[PDB]
Amino acid sequence: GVSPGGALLRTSRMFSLPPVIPPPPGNKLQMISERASATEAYPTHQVLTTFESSRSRGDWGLKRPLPLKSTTGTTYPMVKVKEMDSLEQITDFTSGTQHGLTLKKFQALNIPISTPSEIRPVQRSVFEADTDVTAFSPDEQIQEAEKRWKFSGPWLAGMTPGEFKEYLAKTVRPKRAEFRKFIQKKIAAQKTEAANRELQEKPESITDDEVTEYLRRLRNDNQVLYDLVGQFLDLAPLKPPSPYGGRGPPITHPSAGISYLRTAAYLNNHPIYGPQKSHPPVQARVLKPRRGNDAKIGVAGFVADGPLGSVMDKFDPSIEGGAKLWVNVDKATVDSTGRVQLTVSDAKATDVLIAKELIGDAREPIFGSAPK
Amino acid sequence: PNKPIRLPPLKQLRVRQANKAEENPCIAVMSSVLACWASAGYNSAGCATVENALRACMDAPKPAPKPNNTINYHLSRFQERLTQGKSK
Amino acid sequence: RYIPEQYLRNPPSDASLEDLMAAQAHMGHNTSLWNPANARYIYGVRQGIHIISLETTATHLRRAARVVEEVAYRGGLILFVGTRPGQRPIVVRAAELAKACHLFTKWRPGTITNREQLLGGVPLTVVDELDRPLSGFEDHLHDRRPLAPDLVVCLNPKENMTLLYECSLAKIPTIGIIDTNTNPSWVTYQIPANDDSLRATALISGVLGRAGERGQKRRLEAAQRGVVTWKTPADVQGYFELASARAADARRR
Amino acid sequence: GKGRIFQAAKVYQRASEAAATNIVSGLPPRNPPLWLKAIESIPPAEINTRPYPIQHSPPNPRARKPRNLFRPTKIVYPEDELRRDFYRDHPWELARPRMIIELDGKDARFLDWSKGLRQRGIPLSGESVVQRQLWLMENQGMTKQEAYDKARHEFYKLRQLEQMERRIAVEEARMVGGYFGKDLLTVGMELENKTYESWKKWATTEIARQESARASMY
Amino acid sequence: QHYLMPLRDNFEQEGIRNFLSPGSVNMAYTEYQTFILEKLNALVVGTDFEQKDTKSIVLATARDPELAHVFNHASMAHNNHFFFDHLSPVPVKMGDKLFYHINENFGSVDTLRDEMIGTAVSMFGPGFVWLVRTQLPGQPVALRVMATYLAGSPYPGAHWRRQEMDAQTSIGSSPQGLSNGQRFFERSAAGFKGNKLEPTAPGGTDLIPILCLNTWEYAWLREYGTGVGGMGGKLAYAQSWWNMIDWAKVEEEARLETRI
Amino acid sequence: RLAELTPRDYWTIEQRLSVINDTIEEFSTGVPYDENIEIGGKIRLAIDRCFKYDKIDEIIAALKEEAAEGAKGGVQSWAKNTLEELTQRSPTSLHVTLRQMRLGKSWGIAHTFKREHQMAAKFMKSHDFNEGVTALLIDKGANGPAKWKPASLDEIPPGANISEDYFRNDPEVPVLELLNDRSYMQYPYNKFGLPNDYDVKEAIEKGNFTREKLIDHFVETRRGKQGVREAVSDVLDRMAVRSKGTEHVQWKKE
RNA sequence: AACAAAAAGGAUUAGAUACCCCAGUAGUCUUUGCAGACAAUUAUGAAUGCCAUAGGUUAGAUUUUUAAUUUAGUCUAUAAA
Ligand SMILES: [K+]
Ligand SMILES: [K+]
Ligand SMILES: [Mg+2]
Ligand SMILES: [Mg+2]
Ligand SMILES: [Mg+2]
Ligand SMILES: [Mg+2]
Ligand SMILES: [Mg+2]
Ligand SMILES: [Mg+2]
Ligand SMILES: [Mg+2]
């Protein structure tokens, strides 16, 4: 019954703009700044592009054409729109290269994302048919639920004392009746197990008496109870009797849609030298030197801890442009908060020399001149 | 804490002192000279370097005025859009 | 299937829903900065702005296009008014097609109600069925008062309301692009659409330009067959009466 | 009343009457304006008549004294819920630029989601996943999660090959004497140098400022 | 979207009588160009190149490494159709002006014949062999032969991806190895830093590809076979191709300055 | 919008219709982009080659040829399907129906209704009508297919004309008395629809248009009526020959 | 305790009851009554039905609680009037 004009808008490109997702979650009790805000952990608005011809006119498929002062001249045309029409009759926009190019930088490292491992390194891919699964069935047993990553219930350890009370009085309290039915289904199957077995050599599931007594038998073994309660509220397992239980489930996909590579078990064949041992190094910056009990380094837009090891010790104003060292990214993963934590590992000497050779800035060429 | 209010309809949105008011520098230098005279004394020896600094300013040429800050022009543009409107 | 300067090199005769939606002719203003009066064209609310119904735009656009055609078919003087940074090429092109007058700057208040002073020195001429000068009206082009547009086609009624008021004050029909926050009672024929878009304005103006062009064509085709689709205006008509009076004296005297 | 009495809707009525008779009683009325006959049979449309707007969602049946009856309603589709879910699971999918500038508007004519994610005219993005998800959920009678899993997994495989081509493309190109320009990584670091040096200057100045400002405390 | 277009003289339905059967031309152009374009469309389905022509994509999408994979499909589609727009249903007689100039740069029509053919087999890889017209500010128009590995653009605006030398066997420890090695790095270092090794006139008019020869496997692996026994094979494919060159059209693109 | 229209009392009936026609075209959303003319091209040509005779026997005989495999027309599927439906209806109605199609082309609108009354009055006494209606709508298709008094057209011998009987008004049924006396031979204003063959023909006999210049003539006269370009193109694909190249276009009939 | 009409002193001033100053009693406060006047004001009696929006704000409610709907108040700026 939709009108033809209303049927075109449903599939229009503008109507496809995703809603502004909540910002990257941070500690609920901090002193965040209000007037000034730095770049976020992950993007929140959709980045836009246009044709080189339509950009010279300021046409971005928006309400009105954007100004040419800050929208033309750059190589990569990227822009974010906070409001298509604000109270000032202007499209409140801003450059989107902060996050747009950071994705391109990270995708130039050629590194997959793997599930974190407690401290024999085992980098298991995130995109697998055994772990990456959201759909389920009620009949499924508790064990497979650990594999999942998208739980409907909240994380108890993460919730604040106020949020916890609200959850109890608005999600758990008005569920006793339904929970009683859930037990009946379990008790029903229990009666069928003995019958089926003896028959080799289900009931209507309506017994309000066994249920009450069934819960009094589990008061001495709280473990099996929580195991059952976690299935009715879809809570992330917390006790070892494990995966991502230290910081809780990932609010997003374990890869967070930043890289879709499954493994890095490849050897880039170099033209002259041949198949190299490790991956090409990457130059990074130095932020917050040791002399804060750790050093921060900027590896392709992201901030990660320095390798476990001058340069990191003290700051040096004389160095122009700042201290820049080469380094190899070993492992990358997404924490519960959504940040992209990189296991930056010190690079080798030959790798840097080989990689600089193509750039043409290598002081001494390994090819030919090198006698030994 | 509440957020900044939406200004009522004003005749003209502007700032009185568009450009900062520059304070005569050595008026402070004179204060130091006067201070030393109070503590040390008028016909003393430690006041030489301070008194000589006061003579240095008057001889030195005054700086040139800064370029006007065009802030009232942009405020007049977005007045009707930022506030409730204009009144007359 | 899309060139930026396609609405100028070859504007379309009629604009379909796709063309109007592709030109952002439905992006209304913010929900807060709306005019409840023109809630008859709004379709819904998305992205915090009012969505103008695509069908409502096409219907009013075709209607206005018919108005421009007839007025040009009856020898009317049309005026295309677009006063914005990037609307100069759009208005000039539309005028060429419809053989009309353009205006891409701040309309001087009092050019219709006080035309005697403003448009005093601008020269005029006298044409005929086939739009060619008629020698013999030299004395009439000095006592004649300036002209007024028989139809104004505004592309930003919200900005310039002094022009549209003189049109209603001087009994002149008008056409305008009414946005979500523009009063629809300022113009005679509304065209609910997005006026802040330089791509929709080029489309709407192109369609109206073709209308005038098609109208002018019919008029000239009917003039070559000895069928004039317009009679002498009242002003010039009076001169003929005076001409015979002065000529009558020569006959007797 | 800051407004003015507009009569743009009555230009024909007023003009038609003024041209009915002559001001000099006892003479034939002069010819009317040239536009009077052009819009004779085209009366203006009705304006300023608040109708019942289109209801895009069931109105609250419990409200006994409803307000805002003449207010346009919000447009919500079933996709909105799905788009929010997906893009929250893949926040870095928003860094992939997406053009919302329609070319001709005829982009929904060749979209058949029964084939797969890849379609004609639209790029592989979260939207294709949602539309594909919605299709499976409706036609194939799948659940929200089930349809989400299937379509989502196809999205991954298509993105993996895309990233593999880039690496293999540049690598293979150099095997036959192919050289490229400055990669994005190197360029990014260069710009930081120019910006970091500017910060050093400002820091040095303000540092010296405080030192000179500390001499006055004593 | 980029869509396949017809061939010059209805070769899709009939094909060249003595060079390629209709079936071979079908699999070579209609069933391959379509595949390449299908991939190309998916790559530029939502970028600035959604409406750009193949050549514009080639030149524009050349230096940037991140878009290397787009260059291949775009360039391949261009070169492929560039190779079919120079054949003819019947052999054409070489133009006089062209015939003369050829001898002045290669010595004879047969000298150039065996050079291009010889270069093909020498490559032992899929590539395109061109016939380029070189010109400099004061130097007269001079022709030369160029070999492009896999997808290689002969134009000077795509020098980054010229791919004229296989680094595998052309860079060793011998005297030639070191020489080739230096050039390889000299180009990379120059290109990376933005320096220009060889000045080129604006508009890329120094080099104008006149004729081409597709040596890819799919083109000839069917009609001429594997080539075991020398009967047919890649060699014969190049030979037969030399008889269908539309020398008339070749002369037109040459645009030789009147000097006779 | 139709309510806003206020015509003048001195406007001719033609003017009033013109205003509405132009107003109804303001709400046109455009014909579908994929749906093609169903009865057009081949199928349309087949209809003119099998529905020009005055006897059902000849008509069905022609369809059988088209249905027979290898027919030049290429409408075999349509032809076969059509026959299946023609052999499932009352044979009496077919003869009677076709009879008035040839006689109704010369009657007036007023005379038509008067004859149809007497014509329909004899159908109430007929057996087919009382049987078909009862066996279809009333029974809701129960008891299987209806049973016409003549089982099939084959039963009706060639030399027998059953059509004539109905076309004889009886004195028992009084002549229909209409509410007025207005009448005519052809519709006064039936030109609002898409151009048909009559319009395209007239245009060619009064002009020197080309294959592409003729389409623009109709698109201009109707000023963008949806489907004019497609309709006119179809007419020029069935009854238009390239007699003098692109210079002129003539009809195939000649 | 403090403040402070009155009474009184010191100044100012042409004169100074005054304004200013040193001090100072009723009174202000507590309990029980009288008294009933106020710019006791929103210069707008109380109450009911009804009329288009926007930006804040107060106490709640609902929700995909991020941010939007919504009930009852309050205050700015407007449309029709
Ligand atoms: K006193
Ligand atoms: K309020
Ligand atoms: Mg606007
Ligand atoms: Mg006191
Ligand atoms: Mg009392
Ligand atoms: Mg009081
Ligand atoms: Mg009272
Ligand atoms: Mg209050
Ligand atoms: Mg007020």
How many other CB atoms are found less than 10 A from the CB of residue A260? 22
How many other CB atoms are found less than 10 A from the CB of residue D179? 23
Of F6, F15, F18, the CB nearest to D43: F6
Q: What's the rounded Cα separation, in Å, for the pair F159 and F152? A: 16
What letters, b where the CB count within 10 A reaches 16 and e where it falls short, cover D123-140?
bbbbbbbbbbbbbbbeee
Are C56 and C192 spatial neighbours (Cβ–Cβ below 8 Å)?
Answer: yes
* Helices and strands, number each (H, E), in chain F: 11, 0
Protein CA at C61 to nucleotide C1' at G41, angstroms: 58
Q: What's the rounded Cα separation, in Å, for the pair A287 and A312? A: 9
Residue C184's closest CA among C36, C53, C66? C36
Protein CA at A287 to nucleotide C1' at G67, angstroms: 36
Are A294 and A305 spatial neighbours (Cβ–Cβ below 8 Å)?
Answer: yes
Residue E158's closest CA among E74, E219, E254, E248? E74
Query: Residue ranges of the alpha helices (H) in F89-183?
Result: 91-103, 109-125, 127-133, 163-166
By C1' distance from the Cα of A22, the closest nucleotide is G66
Amino acid code (one letter) for D74? K
CA of A9 to the centre of ligand 5 (A): 75
User: Given an 8 Å threshold on Cβ–Cβ distance, is D175 in contact with E168?
Assistant: yes
Q: What value, to the nearest 5°, has the Cα angle with vertex A308 and ends A305 and A313?
A: 80
CA of B8 to the centre of ligand 8 (A): 20
Residue E150's closest CA among E55, E215, E241, E67? E215
Are F103 and F167 spatial neighbours (Cβ–Cβ below 8 Å)?
Answer: yes
Which residues are CB-contacts of C58 (< 8 A; sequence separation ≥ 6)? A5, C15, C16, C17, C20, F29
How many other CB atoms are found less than 10 A from the CB of residue F161? 11
CA of E198 to the centre of ligand 4 (A): 102
For E144, the 3-state DSSP assignment is strand
Q: What's the rounded Cα separation, in Å, for the pair E94 and A14? A: 58
Task: Give the H or E element holding residue A342.
Answer: strand A340-346
Q: Is C238 on the interface with D (CB under 8 A)?
A: yes
Q: Is E176 on the interface with A (CB under 8 A)?
A: no
Establish how many alpha carbons lie within 13 A of residue E29's alpha carbon, considering only the half-sphere containing its beta carbon.
28
Are F148 and F92 spatial neighbours (Cβ–Cβ below 8 Å)?
Answer: yes
Q: What's the rounded Cα separation, in Å, for the pair E49 and E47? A: 5
Residue for token digits 């929709």?
Answer: C200
User: Given an 8 Å threshold on Cβ–Cβ distance, is D43 in contact with F4?
Assistant: yes
The string of DSSP letters for A68-130 reads STTTSS-SS--EEEEESS-TTSS-EEEE-HHHHHHHHHHTTS----B----------BS--TT
User: Given an 8 Å threshold on Cβ–Cβ distance, is E66 in contact with A108?
Assistant: yes
Amino acid code (one letter) for D175? M
Neighbors of chain F by Cβ distance (3+ pairs < 8 Å): C, D
Q: What's the rounded Cα separation, in Å, for the pair A237 and A258? A: 27
Protein CA at D200 to nucleotide C1' at G24, angstroms: 72
Residue D75's closest CA among C129, F114, A7? A7
* Cβ-based burial of D165 (10 A; exposed 0-12, middle 13-18, buried ≥19): middle
Residue D101's closest CA among C204, A53, F170? A53
Q: What value, to the nearest 5°, has the Cα angle with vertex C94 and ends C91 and C95?
A: 85
Contact list, D107 vs chain C (CB under 8 Å) = none
Q: What is the DSSP letter of E185?
A: H
Are C12 and C207 spatial neighbours (Cβ–Cβ below 8 Å)?
Answer: yes
User: Given an 8 Å threshold on Cβ–Cβ distance, is D45 in contact with F7?
Assistant: no
Amino acid code (one letter) for B47? C
CA–CA distances in Å: residue F111 to residues F124, F165, F171, F173: 21, 18, 17, 16
User: Given an 8 Å threshold on Cβ–Cβ distance, is D88 in contact with A269?
Assistant: no
Are C68 and C26 spatial neighbours (Cβ–Cβ below 8 Å)?
Answer: no
**E133 forms bridges with which residues in the sheet?**
E143, E208
For F143, the 3-state DSSP assignment is coil
Q: Is B78 on the interface with A (CB under 8 A)?
A: yes
Q: What's the rounded Cα separation, in Å, for the pair A254 and A250? A: 6
Protein CA at C186 to nucleotide C1' at G50, angstroms: 30
Contact list, E188 vs chain A (CB under 8 Å) = 358-360
Of F4, F19, F33, the CB nearest to D109: F33
| F abuts E (3+ Cβ pairs < 8 Å) | no
Q: What's the rounded Cα separation, in Å, for the pair E160 and E197? A: 12
Are E244 and E16 spatial neighbours (Cβ–Cβ below 8 Å)?
Answer: yes
Distance of CA F213 to the CA centre of its chain: 29
Task: Give the H or E element holding residue A189.
Answer: helix A176-200
* Helices and strands, number each (H, E), in chain C: 9, 8
By C1' distance from the Cα of B85, the closest nucleotide is G77
Cα dihedral across residues C34, C38, C44, C47: positive or negative: negative
Structure tokens given for D83: 């788009």
What letters, b where the CB count within 10 A reaches 16 and e where it falls short, cover C220-235?
eeebeeeeebbeebee
Protein CA at E240 to nucleotide C1' at G1, angstroms: 127
C174-176 and A302-305 strand pairing: unpaired
Structure tokens given for A112: 């997959």
Q: What's the rounded Cα separation, in Å, for the pair F71 and F64? A: 10
Q: What is the DSSP letter of E30?
A: I
Residue F207's closest CA among F217, F197, F198? F217
Q: What's the rounded Cα separation, in Å, for the pair A325 and A306? A: 11
Q: Is A272 on the interface with E (CB under 8 A)?
A: yes
Structure tokens given for E239: 């030979």
Q: What's the rounded Cα separation, in Å, for the pair A135 and A130? A: 12
Which of C63, C73, C216 is the best mutation test for F, with the most CBs of F within 10 A?
Answer: C63
Are C51 and C43 spatial neighbours (Cβ–Cβ below 8 Å)?
Answer: yes
Are D19 and D36 spatial neighbours (Cβ–Cβ below 8 Å)?
Answer: yes
Task: Give the H or E element holding residue A184.
Answer: helix A176-200
**Main-chain dihedrals φ then ψ at residue A18, nearest 5 degrees:** -70, 150
Q: What is the SS3 string spanning C147-179?
A: CCCCEEEECCCCCCHHHHHHHHHCCCCEEECCC
The beta strands (E) that lie in chain E are given as 127-134, 142-149, 207-214
For A358, the 3-state DSSP assignment is helix
User: Given an 8 Å threshold on Cβ–Cβ distance, is C44 in contact with D44?
Assistant: no
Q: Is A9 on the interface with E (CB under 8 A)?
A: no
Footprint of strand G on the protein (CB under 7 A): A 22, 87, 170; B 2-3, 5-6, 8-9, 84-85, 87; C 31-32, 34, 36-37; D 1-3, 50, 65, 67-68, 70-71, 81, 84
Amino acid code (one letter) for D24? V
Amino acid code (one letter) for C250? A
For A346, the 3-state DSSP assignment is strand
Structure tokens given for C153: 């086609």
Task: Give the H or E element holding residue E76.
Answer: helix E68-84
Task: Give the H or E element holding residue E249.
Answer: helix E247-254
Are A158 and A248 spatial neighbours (Cβ–Cβ below 8 Å)?
Answer: yes
* Cβ-based burial of E2 (10 A; exposed 0-12, middle 13-18, buried ≥19): buried
| B abuts A (3+ Cβ pairs < 8 Å) | yes
**Main-chain dihedrals φ then ψ at residue E156, nearest 5 degrees:** -75, -15
Q: What's the rounded Cα separation, in Å, for the pair D24 and D192? A: 85
Are C48 and C33 spatial neighbours (Cβ–Cβ below 8 Å)?
Answer: no
Residue C17's closest CA among A108, A7, A24? A7
Residues in C lying within 8 Å of F, measured between beta carbons: 13-14, 16-17, 55, 58-59, 62-63, 66, 69, 214
Establish how many alpha carbons lie within 13 A of residue A325's alpha carbon, considering only the half-sphere containing its beta carbon.
20
Residue B15's closest CA among B67, B65, B66, B73? B73
Residue C57's closest CA among C83, C20, C82? C20
Residue for token digits 């032992």?
Answer: E124
For E149, the 3-state DSSP assignment is strand
Helix axes E109-123, E96-106, angle to 10 degrees: 60
Q: What's the rounded Cα separation, in Å, for the pair D86 and D99? A: 19
Q: What is the DSSP letter of F250?
A: B
Q: What is the DSSP letter of A287?
A: B
Interface of F with D in 159-188 (CB under 8 A): none
Structure tokens given for F53: 């005779």
Task: Give the technique used to solve this structure.
Answer: cryo-EM
Q: What's the rounded Cα separation, in Å, for the pair A74 and A72? A: 6
Helix axes F197-204, F228-235, angle to 10 degrees: 70
Residue E166's closest CA among E145, E147, E185? E147
Q: Is E167 on the interface with D (CB under 8 A)?
A: yes
Structure tokens given for E126: 């899929």
Q: What's the rounded Cα separation, in Å, for the pair A253 and D88? A: 8
The string of DSSP letters for F2-60 reads TTT----TT--HHHHHHHHHHHHGGG-----SSPPPSS-THHHHHHHHHS-SS-HHHHH
How many other CB atoms are found less than 10 A from the CB of residue F44? 19
Residue E211's closest CA among E257, E165, E242? E242
Are C68 and C212 spatial neighbours (Cβ–Cβ below 8 Å)?
Answer: yes
Q: What is the SS3 string spanning chain D?
A: CCCCCCCHHHHHHHHHHHCCCCCCCCCCCCCCCCCCCCCCCCCCCCCCCCCCCCCCCCCCCCCCCCCCCCCCCECCCHHHHHHHHHHHHCHHHCCCCCCCCCCCCCCCCCCCCCCCCCCCCCCCCHHHHHHHHHHHHHHCCCCHHHHHHHHHHHHHHHHHHHHHHHHHHHHHHHCCCCCCCCCHHHHHHHHHHHHHHHHHHHHHHHHHHHHHHHCCCC
Are C175 and C153 spatial neighbours (Cβ–Cβ below 8 Å)?
Answer: yes
CA–CA distances in Å: residue D82 to residues A259, A336, D77: 21, 22, 10
